[PDB]
Amino acid sequence: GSLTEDGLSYKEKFVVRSYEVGSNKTATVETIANLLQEVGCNHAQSVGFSATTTTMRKLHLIWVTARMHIEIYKYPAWGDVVEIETWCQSEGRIGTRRDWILKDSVTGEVTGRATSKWVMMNQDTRRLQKVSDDVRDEYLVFCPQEPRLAFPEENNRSLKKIPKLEDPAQYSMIGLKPRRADLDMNQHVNNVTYIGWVLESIPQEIVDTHELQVITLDYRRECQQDDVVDSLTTTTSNDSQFLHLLRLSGDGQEINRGTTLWRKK
Amino acid sequence: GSLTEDGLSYKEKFVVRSYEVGSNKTATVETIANLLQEVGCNHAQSVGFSTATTTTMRKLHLIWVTARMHIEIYKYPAWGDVVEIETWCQSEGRIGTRRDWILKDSVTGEVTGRATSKWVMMNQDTRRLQKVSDDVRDEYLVFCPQEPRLAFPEENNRSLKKIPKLEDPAQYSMIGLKPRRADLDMNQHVNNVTYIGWVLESIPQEIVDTHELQVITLDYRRECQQDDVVDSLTTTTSDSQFLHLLRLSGDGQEINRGTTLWRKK
Ligand SMILES: C[C@@H]1CCCN(C(=O)c2cscn2)CC1
Ligand SMILES: C[C@@H]1CCCN(C(=O)c2cscn2)CC1
Numbered sequence: 053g054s055l056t057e058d059g060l061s062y063k064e065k066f067v068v069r070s071y072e073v074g075s076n077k078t079a080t081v082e083t084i085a086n087l088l089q090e091v092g093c094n095h096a097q098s099v100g101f102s103a104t105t106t107t108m109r110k111l112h113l114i115w116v117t118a119r120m121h122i123e124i125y126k127y128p129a130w131g132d133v134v135e136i137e138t139w140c141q142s143e144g145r146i147g148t149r150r151d152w153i154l155k156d157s158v159t160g161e162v163t164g165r166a167t168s169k170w171v172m173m174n175q176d177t178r179r180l181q182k183v184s185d186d187v188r189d190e191y192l193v194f195c196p197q198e199p200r201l202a203f204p205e206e207n208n209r210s211l212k213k214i215p216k217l218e219d220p221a222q223y224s225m226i227g228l229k230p231r232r233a234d235l236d237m238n239q240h241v242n243n244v245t246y247i248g249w250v251l252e253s254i255p256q257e258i259v260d261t262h263e264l265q266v267i268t269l270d271y272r273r274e275c276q277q278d279d280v281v282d283s284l285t286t287t288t289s290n291d292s293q294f295l296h297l298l299r300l301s302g303d304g305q306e307i308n309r310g311t312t313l314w315r316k317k
Numbered sequence: 318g319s320l321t322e323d324g325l326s327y328k329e330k331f332v333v334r335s336y337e338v339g340s341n342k343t344a345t346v347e348t349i350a351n352l353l354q355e356v357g358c359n360h361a362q363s364v365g366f367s368t369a370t371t372t373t374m375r376k377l378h379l380i381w382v383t384a385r386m387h388i389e390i391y392k393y394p395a396w397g398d399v400v401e402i403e404t405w406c407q408s409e410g411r412i413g414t415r416r417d418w419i420l421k422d423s424v425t426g427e428v429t430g431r432a433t434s435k436w437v438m439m440n441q442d443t444r445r446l447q448k449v450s451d452d453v454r455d456e457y458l459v460f461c462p463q464e465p466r467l468a469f470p471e472e473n474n475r476s477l478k479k480i481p482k483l484e485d486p487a488q489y490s491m492i493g494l495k496p497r498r499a500d501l502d503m504n505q506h507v508n509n510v511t512y513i514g515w516v517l518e519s520i521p522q523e524i525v526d527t528h529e530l531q532v533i534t535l536d537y538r539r540e541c542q543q544d545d546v547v548d549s550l551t552t553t554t555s556d557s558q559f560l561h562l563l564r565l566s567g568d569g570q571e572i573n574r575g576t577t578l579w580r581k582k
Contacts, residue, residue: 070358071351071510073503077368082499086336093335097397130368130503227493232525233514237335237342237396244336248499259498 053094060196061139062095065157068128078127079134081251081264085122085244088152088166091136105190112175113187117243118147119169121203121210121268126156126163133157140195145182147171148191151202165202167210178274214270214309217297221284225252227301228281241275246308250296253285254312262292262314269310275300281307291315318359325462326405327360330423333394343393344400346517346530350388350510353418353432356402364460371456378441379453381414383509385435387469387476387534392422392429399423406461411448413437414457417468431468433476444540480536480574483562487550491518493566494547507541512573516561519551520577528557528579535575541565547572556580 053064072083096103103115128134138152147170154164172187173180203210234245247269275281280301285294291313298308318329337348361369369381394400404418413436420430438453439446469476500511513535541547546566551559556578563573 069351069355071354071502071508074498075501075503075505077503080499086334089336090334131362227495228497229493231494231514231518232339233345233347235340237338237340239340242336248497252497 053091053098055095055098056137059099060194061137061200062091062098063135063137064091064094065133065135066090068130068132068134070130073130075260076127076263078129081122081124081127081267082244082248084124084127084154084164085120085247087134087136088122088138089242089244091138091152092150095138095140099194105187107184107187107190108172113172113181114175115148115170116173116180117168117271118171119268119270120166120243120247121168121266122164122166123203123209123266124154124164124264127263128154128156128163134163139200140191141200142183142188142192142195143169145188147183148195151200153202167202209266209268209313212268212311214268214311215295216306216309217284217286217295221253221297222286223253223255224285225249225283228252228283229279230275230277235277239277241277243271246271246275246298249281249283249298250285250308250310250312253283253296254294258292258314261317263317264312265315266313267310269296269308271308273305273307275307318356318363320360320363321403324364325460326403326466327356327363328401328403329356329359330399330401331355333396333398333400335396338396340526341529343395346388346390346393346533347510347514349390349393349420349430350386350513352400352402353388353404354508354510356404356418357416360404360406371453373450373453373456374438379438379447380441381436382439382446383434383537384413384437385476385534385536386432386509386513387434387532388430388432389469389475389532390420390430390530392427393529394422394429400429405466406457407466408449408454408458408461409435411454413449414461417466419468433468475532475534475578478534480534480576481560482571482574483550483552483560487519487562488552489519489521490551491515491549494518494549495545496541496543501543505543507543509537512537512541512563515547515549515563516551516573516575516577519549519561520559524557524579527582529582530577531580532578533575535561535573537573539570539572541572 068079074080135155141149150168152166230241236242284297288295294312296310333344339345401421407415416434418432437446496507502508550562559577561575
């Protein structure tokens with residue numbers, strides 16, 4: 053991959069692997085989410101990061117995902133090449149937004165797009181804090197100055213408020229535990245695992261007859277390596293919509309909430 | 318990737334991704350196992366095996382199934398490094414075929430790991446393993462070297478050693494392991510790599526933090542269904558050596574058995 057001519061965004065091509073596809077022989081949404089993560093890490097490394105600054109490392113601060121929103125029009129087939137362009141933009145003292153565009157390497161048509169909201173947090177106390185002006189100036193130079201939104205729409209699904217699922221849930225997957233493959237290089241559960249856990253409560257009948265078009269996932273609390281999670285889903289609707297909730301198997305503490313939108317094959 | 322000059326083996330280069338590495342920022346053994354699988358699929362596709370079945374095998378409802386996997390790693394590739402893998406097949410008479418791999422450093426050319434696997438023929442409906450017929454053997458002998466080519470040539474080595482059954486009580490255990498949709502392949506079967514991850518779940522974190530996995534030999538006895546639950550058992554048999562057993566959470570039916578060998582960091 054490489055930064056674009058203006059150095060304000062990054063592009064990378066990926067060939068879809070055998071183990072990355074589903075029953076329809078096309079890449080899963082979790083594989084897509086992993087590819088978004090990979091191009092985001094490479095963009096950060098290319099502009100002198102390792103996504104902490106010296107001021108963030110000095111104050112023990114980190115970037116944490118608050119929301120992820122993915123919309124897929126066409127999933128790449130096994131063996132196809134997909135090009136992803138990614139970039140960041142400041143949103144004032146709230147935090148930063150990171151967006152992506154997925155394109156067909158042969159046709160150049162847009163086959164998917166994503167947006168995510170990130171907030172600053174103290175690594176040790178887990179206390180969120182607004183972005184200080186001194187931290188902002190350090191990365192503003194790597195972002196475009198004019199707004200550049202993967203989801204410009206006058207009123208888009210990426211910024212909709214998500215409500216809390218009411219018991220009893222219509223569908224459920226109980227006793228989900230992460231394994232070592234679910235952890236990152238810092239022994240924390242990978243943000244993609246939550247996507248897989250959310251989708252575990254969707255009935256296989258929906259999975260066999262429908263394709264996932266949209267998914268918006270709010271991140272509320274981290275799941276520890278030794279925690280157990282319950283995945284809950286309720287239908288809220290040619291198109292199927294679901295409301296999701298991830299919570300701790302025991303006390304029922306909320307870790308995630310989201311919505312998915314599926315269309316008929 | 319591409320077939321070598323003689324068309325008797327295949328090579329492919331992989332860049333190590335951010336989500337593919339462990340706590341010491343070097344690729345996991347499951348990532349290595351996935352890369353072995355990917356280069357094996359590409360080798361099969363390049364010599365005329367469509368979405369590793371032949372026209373005669375398709376006609377008779379026959380498939381290739383792994384019986385044993387043996388991986389030895391000297392140096393795990395770091396995040397961002399390129400690793401080149403060369404793979405090939407060889408017939409072993411009526412028993413079945415063997416598939417071997419050599420892992421090399423793209424910069425130095427030194428061997429950083431090597432693997433071998435034994436495959437047998439099985440009816441995909443009855444699960445009855447059969448010997449390699451004759452009309453089938455001749456159909457693929459032309460894609461394998463005629464003189465022996467072994468990733469593990471040593472006379473009386475670890476790849477061919479007999480594995481015993483773990484005796485209760487196990488010293489360590491991880492119970493209630495269930496596969497999720499990401500653990501399944503394009504045919505809704507549990508991926509052979511998931512078993513490696515499940516075996517390693519019962520290894521104490523103390524071993525994982527102080528040691529590196531050098532060797533792993535895994536026998537495949539029975540498939541784990543999408544709705545099955547597995548228990549992972551381990552006992553120290555000693556460098557550190559362990560004896561492993563995967564079995565069904567309920568009745569205690571054997572699905573896998575193996576051994577690992579770990580070196581101090
Ligand atoms: C271009 C970009 C500048 C902003 C920070 N960054 C990130 O990737 C990031 C995503 S969420 C918070 N930090 C590194 C590189
Ligand atoms: C070169 C090779 C030769 C025949 C078998 N094969 C495999 O991929 C295979 C079978 S069992 C493990 N590997 C297809 C192509």
